[PDB]
Write a protein that binds this ligand. Structure first.
Ligand code: CU
Ligand code: CU
Ligand code: ZN
Ligand code: ZN
Lengths: 153, 153
């Protein structure tokens, strides 16, 4: 199965994130190219629960977390399914890369098809900060762009 | 389950379409409000196969048609699952309404979550025209706006 989200917003950031998962047990490969960010920085990149764009990136809701865990890094055992950590931007403000993840899936009961991807304006502290906020969003700040994840071929 | 698609494009048409389906056998209720159309007209309103917005409304692909039928009216026995007929616009160019449909579903193998809704710039001839085109798209013309269908609460 393949899916894609086109990230848009009014803050100058935009980009495309592609997902591919051959079958249920295979991990999903996530590839992204996002431009217009601050340069040489780290920015929070998450999958949020709803694919509702009626109110900017606000209506995407909180991070996708069917197992009711606290926020963390992609490699922590305790994390939200939606937590993809930070993406690093180059000197031109572009973040480009790909990685594989075993919790995010396009098939089955926790599929993220129909949900949203959000790129934040701040760095995700990976749930290592000292507020209740760190344990919810990573204190990643505003949401300059987001897009609903749709099926593609 | 509830889902929503926010229709956007560069041609002045925009709108929101909400879907709700309580369970598998229940029909789905579709409610829409779309503005910026020509006034007092009929315009094709369909669900297309892919939720891919990387190329305008072009990458939405053709109508959603898992059963490989030809295009038709919502009430014909032979139609695409995606065929919702025409919506009528008022003197201000607004189309607003709701209806129930038993082929479109948000649950199960033919779910339309992750696919797209498209409002066209022309009238859908309901597969009653005389071209091979009528049997594919209803000869509904260009696609001024579209949106991916995402989950909501
Ligand atoms: Cu977030
Ligand atoms: Cu169409
Ligand atoms: Zn999180
Ligand atoms: Zn059709």
């Amino acid at each position: 199965v393949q899916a894609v989200a086109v990230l848009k917003g009014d803050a100058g950031v935009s980009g495309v994130v592609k997902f591919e998962q051959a079958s249920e047990s295979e991990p999903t490969t996530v590839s992204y190219e996002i431009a217009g960010n601050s340069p040489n920085a780290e920015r929070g990149f998450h999958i949020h629960e709803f694919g509702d764009a009626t109110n900017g990136c606000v209506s995407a809701g909180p991070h996708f977390n069917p197992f009711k865990k606290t926020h963390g890094a992609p490699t922590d055992e305790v994390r939200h399914v939606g937590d993809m950590g930070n993406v690093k931007t180059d000197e031109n403000g572009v973040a480009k890369g790909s990685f594989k993840d075993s919790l995010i899936k396009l098939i089955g009961p926790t599929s993220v098809v129909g949900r949203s991807v959000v790129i934040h304006a701040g760095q995700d502290d990976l749930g290592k900060g000292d507020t209740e906020e760190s344990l919810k969003t990573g204190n990643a700040g505003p949401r300059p762009a987001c897009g609903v994840i749709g099926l593609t071929n």
